């Protein structure tokens, strides 16, 4: 249950420190919405560029 606990710790910390960082890196990008940068290939959980 400790081992089950820490993975749930490592889950939710990974949730925040992915989804926040997935919410970020699109806020700089998906607010300009043209946003010509084909380095979306670092999150691939927040997706769909504009062909550019």
């Amino acid at each position: 249950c400790t081992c089950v606990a820490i993975i749930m710790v490592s889950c939710v910390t990974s949730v925040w420190l992915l989804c926040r960082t997935r919410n970020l890196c699109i806020t700089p990008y998906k607010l300009a919405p043209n946003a010509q940068v084909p380095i979306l290939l670092a999150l691939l959980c927040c997706i769909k560029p504009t062909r550019a």
Partner: peptide, 9 residues
Amino acid sequence: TWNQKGVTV
């Protein structure tokens, strides 16, 4: 605003 690259900053 936006960068010259278009990045919102």
